[PDB]
Design a binder for this molecule. Structure first.
Ligand SMILES: CCCCCCCCCCCCCCCCCC(=O)OC[C@H](CO[C@@H]1O[C@H](CO[C@H]2O[C@H](CO)[C@H](O)[C@H](O)[C@H]2O)[C@H](O)[C@H](O)[C@H]1O)OC(=O)CCCCCCCCCCCCCCCCC
Ligand code: CLA
Ligand code: CLA
Ligand code: CLA
Ligand SMILES: CC(C)=CCC/C(C)=C/CC/C(C)=C/CC/C(C)=C/CC/C(C)=C/CC/C(C)=C/CC/C(C)=C/CC/C(C)=C/CC/C(C)=C/CC1=CC(=O)C(C)=C(C)C1=O
Ligand SMILES: CCCCCCCCCCCCCCCCCC(=O)OC[C@H](CO[C@@H]1O[C@H](CO)[C@H](O)[C@H](O)[C@H]1O)OC(=O)CCCCCCCCCCCCCCCCC
Ligand SMILES: CCCCCCCCCCCCCCCCCC(=O)OC[C@H](CO[C@@H]1O[C@H](CO)[C@H](O)[C@H](O)[C@H]1O)OC(=O)CCCCCCCCCCCCCCCCC
Ligand SMILES: CCCCCCCCCCCCCCCCCC(=O)OC[C@H](CO[C@@H]1O[C@H](CO)[C@H](O)[C@H](O)[C@H]1O)OC(=O)CCCCCCCCCCCCCCCCC
Ligand SMILES: CC1=C(/C=C/C(C)=C/C=C/C(C)=C/C=C/C=C(C)/C=C/C=C(C)/C=C/C2=C(C)CCCC2(C)C)C(C)(C)CCC1
Ligand SMILES: CC1=C(/C=C/C(C)=C/C=C/C(C)=C/C=C/C=C(C)/C=C/C=C(C)/C=C/C2=C(C)CCCC2(C)C)C(C)(C)CCC1
Ligand SMILES: CC1=C(/C=C/C(C)=C/C=C/C(C)=C/C=C/C=C(C)/C=C/C=C(C)/C=C/C2=C(C)CCCC2(C)C)C(C)(C)CCC1
Ligand SMILES: CCCCCCCCCCCCO[C@@H]1O[C@H](CO)[C@@H](O[C@H]2O[C@H](CO)[C@@H](O)[C@H](O)[C@H]2O)[C@H](O)[C@H]1O
Ligand SMILES: [Ca+2]
Ligand SMILES: [Fe+2]
Lengths: 77, 30, 34, 37, 38, 34, 340, 485, 35, 65
């Protein structure tokens, strides 16, 4: 059905005026609730280094990598 | 020896140029 | 129906707004320098 | 000795000669430096 | 062609949909990011 | 200077050989009757 | 038979042609594009390069990117369920699993797409020169994002997916491989640069050599979507260039084949050059030059000059660009000119 | 007529002259092999397998001949370095001899098949016109291959009726030709286990013999014969090339990463061994062991075999080098003469310092010295204006153990720095730069070249496949299209 | 025998077939619903 | 044409030219080994890449024992 017709159908907007902002507010909350940070192990502004340390948590060996990463989170990093 | 080789090729490209512009196959219609 | 030229100028400003929010975010966010 | 019937003649027009030579010469101008290294 | 019917859940709908919903789920997050202070 | 000894012959044959190729063809084409 | 019915359905002429190829193309092509867009905004490169790399951290469209895996990973495929991530998703993300994901997926996606061209070509009954052409971009992707790092220590030295993250790939190659001095890279550019010329030049030659088929000024409408006569004076074009440049086309069939050739050949060459940079078999120096520079301190060419620029690039970058090497270059060891 | 780039299409369906052609090619490839051999034999120096082995002399063909048995010369010497050995007829000379002849014969054969191109065997009884039943051919050939594949693994590699293959320890110090027993277990899929190369050829050989028969009997399902335009030789090509470049990308990978098939004592070290300090660890391990058994530092290091120390030199890393840095590795740093010995750097306080090694990536690298904990203790400054660690200010000294310089110590800054400047490349050696008139700029090993060449050819062949394949599925639309809308 | 990485291989070899499955399932089905 | 000793002896082997099996012949059976090969490669690949470790198989210079 010719896009033109659909993007003009009041039915369309009646549906998407609900759907679009829906998706938006969802993603917004995804970030604003701090959930995204945990889904992607991404550091929060206060989690790059431990208070004193100025070294980087560089993963140094493949196989025991996951294990090594976990320990990096340990030093309150 | 190298200089000569560089200039020679250059001189050869310019020669080509000449022949290409002035000795092409006249472009015939229909 | 909803006149096309309006669907556009509305969806249009709508983008200049979001893309503009991004430009503001550049002097305030984390991508700041302050 | 039957004249083999699978042969055709070969051709290279003047323009192709030129396009050819232009390529050979310039490649030579491009690689000679590395050959003499 | 046809007494001009057309189905609601078409085919291209999908194509333009898997590139739709997500596009917004992001442009909705990405905006909310601008408010993250240091 | 301190260049490669084979550089000269490498460049010479690199130009001659294929040029000689094309030329052999062009002339044999060029001389085909009618 | 279901097969021919499965076929029937696929090869059905829709808005977005699917086809057999699509069964490979779309799954991948979408995953590649998706993974990028995901990492660009959500995943970080801290545990990997000690770098913030996503919108969520503060990066903008230029500084964001899906960074390569650690150097520890080596050439590991880094599968979500492999020895590294171990089925875990978040860890996978932090170990740069998203790179081999985008890489490998997009890779198949380029196979699928070329196949598509091949499949659609066949159906529509046209020659496959659109597929031959696309071999060029495959070669680039294959040699650069796969063959290259496969020759190095690991995926870590492959170009990371991102805008800026690619500029450092460029600067690196200058600094370490002195890539600009490579015969193959040169051919590369001669083709891309020369290809973007044919493009522009041919376009203009056509638009300003058009016949009048309308009474309007905006001559766009004056075009016969249904063939017939040539829409522009091929005969006039020939005479123009033949008098301003000295040389000029006169066989649209060749003029157009040439346009396929130039840029596809260029990219092929630029690829070979890189396939060689994998083994580090670079075109770094000219020995005769170095020898004279050693014995004679007053000999200076724009070449020697460059090599010094490289030394600086390597010395000042290596530290934060190769973290796994725990480099420590005392201030006194850092090459620098006067004052600066 | 025919464009220059099509002249060979004159064979697309002249099975006779196609064989005449393919015969000439084989002749040239065999011919090349024979004579590339003689070229190496006329320039290869057997005087020293320890520090000047074939892979330092830009040998490319000589290694592939040792990997399968030929390890001697009719002149008396041998790859392993033994004397009095009798290689018999199959010496490098022999192999080279053989190919040159096989080439002459294939030549004559190519001539005969060219003149007698119209043998009936190529004409189909039915249509009475030229034709080759590909599907059956493939079956036949595939049968012979597996039959030969089998034999190669069954009799050659196993020693039953043959020499064996090159086998060496984990640090290329013992290598030689030895009979290898099969291996069907799982570890036989490990690239570094010779047993796998045997099992493979026996199993794959058999599977190859079976599969051949199948194809000699069962015919191609109509559906396919149609899809894959069989009975059109220009498609046999599109598929073969796809296989040939697949084979290629693989040999290029096993050459670069290493395998029981590309042994270091024949192709040279790996860029990866230097990366992981492979040989550096094997040395230490050994040195610390000797110290345990109460040896002296002199004695410990002196125990370290020259060959072993040599692999721990960045100048044998295939990753160093350049595209136009031609020749053997010897035109670079020079013919290796002897191991100067292990260099230990210390500073006034007696503290032992360590030289940061050169990563393959860097053409030039700085001299930096750190202690065990990695603290920078000394270095060679650029701007002296404010240097805190100059070898001078630190009293850096250098001592050697085992080798030419064994037992000696050097304390005059310049000499210390000279060696420090060398430590960067790993074990310090003594080169003869005169002979070959070397320039002192690193060149890559055969391992490196073979890898570059095959990775390119492969990637180039991909394009051939895509081209010929397309030209097979679109033969009809070739030359152009036509009508309708 | 059957080491952790061997189990993972199956998990991926199985998780893979499934995807091919549901895909060809869905496809073979909808294909046979109009043409 | 030109028959010859060897030529006749080999005459059979090359004659069944266009001879094809009917329909989808052996296709399905073929599509299985094909899938088997595909999995076989992925294994030996993943073994070389140390993604699939197997005690007993040590993918390094050693193992030579
Ligand atoms: C059109 C094109 C379409 C392409 C479509 C592609 C679809 C999917 C492609 C998948 C490719 C994955 C490659 C697998 C790989 O890289 O797997 C790589 C592994 C090698 O592992 C590497 O090993 C290296 C060193 O190991 C060796 O050296 C080490 C040093 O101590 C150790 O001793 C170790 O025991 C020893 O094995 C390093 O550790 C690296 O970190 C590690 O990645 O094996 C191997 O390569 C496997 C052998 C494959 C060779 C194929 C090469 C083809 C072209 C090569 C060009 C090179 C230039
Ligand atoms: C296929 C792989 C192959 C490989 C890996 C090698 C490798 C090697 N050879 Mg052999 N060789 C080969 C094939 C091969 N050779 C063949 C077929 C012959 C007979 C013709 C020889 C004859 C030969 C001799 C006589 C010698 C060697 C030597 C050497 C070593 C030289 C070291 C060096 O610096 O290389 C240098 C490498 C290059 C210059 C490659 C660069 C190619 C570039 C310049 C051009 C591509 C051109 C094209 C026009 C580009 C664009 C085209 C456009 C249309 C797109 C090296 C180990 C030397 C040796 O053994 O010393 C001890 C030596 O003396 N080789
Ligand atoms: C492996 C076997 C193989 C075979 C049998 C063929 C055979 C053929 N190809 Mg083909 N091709 C291949 C691989 C192969 N190709 C690869 C890997 C590529 C990718 C680069 C191509 C790309 C290609 C194109 C683009 C075209 C062909 C065409 C043709 C036909 C050309 C007629 C001819 O001989 O020109 C005669 C050739 C010359 C006079 C000069 C060639 C000079 C240079 C390239 C080489 C000099 C030799 C070199 C030093 C030797 C080492 C080679 C190395 C691979 C070992 C012919 C049927 C043409 C065709 O089918 O048109 C309708 C065509 O347009 N091929
Ligand atoms: C349509 C084509 C398609 C293709 C080609 C791929 C390909 C790939 N995906 Mg992918 N994917 C797809 C669709 C596709 N995907 C879809 C729709 C989704 C969303 C659900 C995903 C979600 C996804 C994720 C989340 C991941 C991948 C990953 C991968 C890679 C995994 C490597 C692997 O082990 O392969 C799997 C290979 C097989 C299953 C082999 C098939 C064998 C068949 C022929 C026969 C089976 C027979 C029998 C049952 C065997 C028993 C034998 C007996 C002796 C035991 C690989 C490149 C991983 C990755 O990117 O890592 C970096 C990853 O983490 N994909
Ligand atoms: C002794 C001394 C002084 C020595 C040297 C001096 C010196 C500095 C020399 C520098 C030169 C040098 C060394 C250069 C290095 C670069 C080089 C040689 C690389 C070579 C290898 C290479 C790039 C190979 C392959 C890559 C490739 C295909 C490149 C193509 C480049 C190329 C030809 C681009 C086209 C440029 C161009 C002007 C096209 C014009 C086309 C045509 C005339 C348009 C007219 C026209 C348009 C129409 O639309 C229509 C309709 C018609 C009808 C028509 O006619
Ligand atoms: C449906 C079918 C879709 C098909 C294609 C979609 C292609 C999408 C590309 C989207 C890029 C999005 C970038 C983005 O969202 O950035 C969001 C970012 C982040 O901006 C940063 O956000 C941070 C917090 O997350 C902080 O607030 C920073 O201060 C702020 O600068 O981008 C920008 O500000 C971008 C200005 C971008 C101008 C882009 C021109 C892009 C041209 C692209 C391709 C041209 C060809
Ligand atoms: C073992 C040893 C092997 C040794 C090999 C010997 C070497 C072989 C050398 C081959 C010569 C090739 C030339 C032939 C001509 C030719 O190919 O055209 C011939 C072909 C086909 O041309 C067609 O010929 C047909 C009949 O033959 C018809 O005449 C058609 O009209 C015509 O189009 O055209 C092409 O090849 C297109 C290639 C495009 C050329 C690009 C030029 C490159 C310039 C790049 C930028 C340079 C800038 C310089 C900077 C200063
Ligand atoms: C006084 C002169 C001042 C400047 C003169 C400039 C000379 C231009 C030479 C162009 C000749 C092209 C030609 O004849 O090929 C002519 C052929 C085209 O010719 C075509 O041939 C076809 C059959 O193959 C058909 O017959 C067509 O009808 C015909 O047009 O190739 C080209 O199309 C040339 C276009 C490529 C662009 C030219 C790049 C120039 C680079 C030259 C290298 C520079 C070296 C620098 C060294 C430092
Ligand atoms: C989608 C689209 C689009 C879009 C568009 C848009 C979106 C637009 C918008 C627009 C707009 C949105 C506009 C606006 C305008 C405005 C104006 C023009 C204004 C003016 C004003 C004034 C003048 C004022 C005044 C004043 C005031 C208010 C106060 C103070 C004082 C004074 C008095 C000054 C287009 C079409 C391209 C096409 C395609 C599609
Ligand atoms: C990863 C992954 C996954 C999933 C996911 C996905 C698939 C996603 C997607 C996503 C997406 C798909 C997203 C998107 C986004 C987007 C955005 C965010 C956008 C933006 C935009 C903008 C901002 C724009 C702008 C503009 C332009 C460019 C131009 C001019 C104009 C304007 C201004 C309008 C899975 C699980 C499978 C697996 C693993 C991996
Ligand atoms: C008949 C006869 C005889 C004799 C024979 C002979 C003596 C032969 C020979 C033969 C030979 C003696 C051969 C040789 C060959 C060679 C070749 C075939 C080569 C090739 C090469 C190439 C192809 C190259 C290339 C290249 C270059 C140059 C550079 C750059 C790169 C490349 C790699 C591309 C006798 C008396 C026994 C008796 C009976 C009969
Ligand atoms: C729908 C598409 C699904 C695609 C993939 C689903 C993969 C699930 O993958 C599976 O996750 C479990 C953890 O929950 C992993 O389990 C792994 O980590 C745990 C610890 O957390 C270990 O104890 C375990 O020995 C190890 O194998 C498996 O190794 C992995 O293969
Ligand atoms: Ca705060
Ligand atoms: Fe055009």
């Amino acid at each position: 059905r010719p896009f033109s017709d659909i993007i003009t159908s009041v039915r369309y907007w009646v549906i998407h005026s609900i759907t679009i902002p829906a998706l938006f507010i969802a993603g917004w909350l995804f970030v604003s609730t701090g959930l995204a940070y945990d889904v992607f192990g991404t550091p929060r502004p206060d989690s790059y280094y431990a208070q004193e340390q100025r070294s980087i948590p560089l993963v140094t060996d493949r196989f025991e990598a996951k294990q090594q990463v976990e320990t990096f989170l340990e030093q309150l990093k | 020896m190298e200089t000569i080789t560089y200039v020679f090729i250059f001189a050869c490209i310019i020669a080509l140029f000449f022949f290409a512009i002035f000795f092409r196959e006249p472009p015939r219609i229909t | 129906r909803i006149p096309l030229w309006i669907v556009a100028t509305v969806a249009g400003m709508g983008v200049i707004v979001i893309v503009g929010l991004f430009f503001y975010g550049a002097y305030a966010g984390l991508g700041s320098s302050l | 000795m039957e004249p083999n019937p699978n042969r055709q003649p070969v051709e290279l027009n003047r323009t192709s000669l030129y396009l050819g030579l232009l390529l050979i010469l310039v490649l030579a101008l491009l690689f000679s430096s590395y050959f003499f290294n | 062609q046809e007494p001009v019917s057309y189905p609601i859940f078409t085919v291209r709908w999908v194509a333009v949909h898997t590139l739709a919903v997500p596009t917004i789920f992001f442009l909705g997050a990405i905006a909310a990011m601008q408010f993250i202070q240091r | 200077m301190e260049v490669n000894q084979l550089g000269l012959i490498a460049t010479a044959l690199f130009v001659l050989v294929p040029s000689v190729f094309l030329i052999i063809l062009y002339v044999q084409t060029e001389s085909q009757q009618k | 038979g279901w097969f021919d019915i499965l076929d029937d359905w696929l090869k059905r002429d829709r808005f977005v042609f699917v086809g057999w190829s699509g069964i490979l193309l779309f799954p991948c092509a979408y995953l590649a594009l998706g993974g990028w867009l995901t990492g660009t905004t959500f995943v970080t490169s801290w545990y990997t390069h000690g770098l913030a790399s996503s919108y969520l951290e503060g990066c903008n469209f230029l500084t964001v990117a899906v960074s390569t895996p650690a150097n520890s990973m080596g050439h590991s495929l880094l599968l979500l369920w492999g020895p590294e991530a171990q089925g875990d998703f978040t860890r996978w993300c932090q170990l740069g699993g998203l790179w081999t994901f985008i890489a490998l997926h997009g890779a198949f996606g380029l196979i699928g797409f070329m196949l598509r061209q091949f499949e659609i070509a066949r159906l529509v009954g046209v020659r496959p020169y659109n597929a031959i052409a696309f071999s060029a971009p495959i070669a680039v992707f294959v040699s650069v994002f796969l063959i290259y790092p496969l020759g190095q220590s690991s995926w870590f030295f492959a170009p990371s997916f991102g805008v800026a993250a690619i500029f450092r790939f460029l600067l690196f190659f200058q600094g370490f491989h002195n890539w600009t001095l490579n015969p193959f890279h040169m051919m590369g550019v001669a083709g891309v640069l020369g290809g973007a010329l044919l493009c522009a030049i041919h376009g203009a030659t056509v638009e300003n050599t058009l016949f009048q088929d309308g009474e309007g000024a905006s001559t766009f409408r004056a075009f016969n979507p249904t063939q017939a006569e040539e829409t522009y004076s091929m005969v006039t074009a020939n005479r123009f260039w033949s008098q301003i440049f000295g040389i000029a086309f006169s066989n649209k069939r060749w003029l157009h084949f040439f346009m396929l050739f130039v840029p596809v050949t260029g990219l092929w060459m630029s690829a070979i050059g890189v396939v060689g940079l994998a083994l580090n078999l670079r075109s770094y120096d000219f020995i005769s030059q170095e020898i004279r520079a050693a014995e004679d301190p007053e000999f200076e060419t724009f070449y020697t000059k460059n090599l010094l620029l490289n030394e600086g690039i390597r010395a000042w970058m290596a530290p934060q660009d190769q973290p796994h090497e725990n480099f420590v270059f005392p201030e006194e060891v850092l090459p620098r000119g006067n004052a600066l | 007529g025919l464009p220059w780039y099509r002249v060979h299409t004159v064979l697309i369906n002249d099975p006779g002259r196609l064989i005449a052609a393919h015969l000439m090619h084989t002749a040239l490839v065999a011919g090349w092999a024979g004579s590339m051999a003689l070229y190496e034999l006329a320039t290869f120096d057997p005087s020293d397998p320890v520090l000047n082995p074939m892979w330092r002399q830009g040998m490319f063909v000589l290694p592939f001949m040792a990997r399968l048995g030929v390890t001697g010369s009719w002149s008396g010497w041998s790859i392993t370095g033994e004397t009095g050995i009798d290689p018999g007829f199959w010496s490098f000379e022999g192999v080279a001899l053989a190919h040159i002849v096989l080439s002459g014969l294939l030549f004559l054969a190519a001539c005969w098949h060219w003149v007698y191109w119209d043998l009936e065997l190529f004409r189909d009884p039915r249509t009475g016109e030229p034709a080759l039943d590909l599907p059956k051919m493939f079956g036949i050939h595939l049968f012979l291959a597996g039959l030969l594949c089998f034999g190669f693994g069954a009799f050659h590699l196993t020693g039953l009726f043959g020499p064996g293959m090159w086998v060496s320890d984990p640090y290329g110090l013992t290598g030689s030709v030895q009979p290898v027993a099969p291996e069907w277990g799982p570890d036989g899929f490990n690239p570094y286990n010779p047993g796998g190369v045997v099992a493979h050829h026996i199993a794959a050989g058999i599977v190859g013999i079976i599969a051949g028969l199948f194809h000699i009997l069962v015919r191609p399902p109509q559906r396919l014969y149609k899809a894959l335009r069989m009975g059109n030789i220009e498609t046999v090509l599109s598929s073969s090339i796809a296989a040939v470049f697949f084979a290629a990308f693989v040999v290029a990978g096993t050459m670069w990463y290493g395998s029981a098939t590309t042994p270091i004592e024949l192709f040279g070290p790996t860029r990866y061994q230097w990366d992981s300090s492979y040989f550096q660890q094997e040395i230490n391990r050994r040195v610390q062991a000797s110290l345990a058994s109460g040896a002296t530092l002199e004695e410990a290091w002196s125990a370290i075999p020259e060959k072993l120390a040599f692999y721990d030199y960045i100048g044998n890393n295939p990753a160093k080098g350049g595209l136009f840095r031609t020749g053997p590795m010897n035109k670079g740093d020079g013919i290796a003469q002897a191991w100067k010995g292990h260099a230990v750097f210390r500073n006034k306080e007696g503290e032992e310092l360590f030289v940061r090694r050169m990563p393959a990536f860097f053409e030039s690298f700085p001299v930096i010295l750190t202690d065990k904990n990695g603290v920078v203790k000394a270095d060679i400054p650029f701007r002296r204006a404010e240097s805190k660690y100059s070898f001078e200010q630190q009293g850096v000294t250098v001592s050697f153990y085992g080798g030419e310089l064994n037992g000696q110590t050097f304390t005059d800054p310049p000499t210390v720095k000279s060696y420090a400047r060398k430590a960067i490349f790993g074990e310090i050696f003594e080169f003869d730069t005169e002979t070959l008139n070397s320039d002192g700029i690193f060149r890559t090993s055969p391992r490196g070249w073979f890898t570059f060449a095959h990775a390119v050819f492969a990637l180039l062949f991909f394009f051939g496949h895509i081209w010929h394949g397309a030209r097979t599925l679109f033969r009809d639309v070739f030359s152009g299209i036509d009508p309708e809308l | 025998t059957i080491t952790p990485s061997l189990k993972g291989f199956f998990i991926g070899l199985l998780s893979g077939a499934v995807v091919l499955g549901l895909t060809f399932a869905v496809l073979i089905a909808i294909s046979q619903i109009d043409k | 044409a030109r028959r010859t000793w060897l030529g006749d002896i080999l005459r059979p082997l090359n004659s069944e030219y266009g001879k094809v099996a009917p329909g989808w012949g052996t296709t399905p059976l073929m599509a299985v080994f094909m899938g088997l090969f595909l999995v076989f490669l992925l294994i030996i690949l993943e073994i070389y890449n140390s993604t699939l470790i197997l005690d007993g198989v040590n993918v390094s210079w050693k193992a030579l024992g």
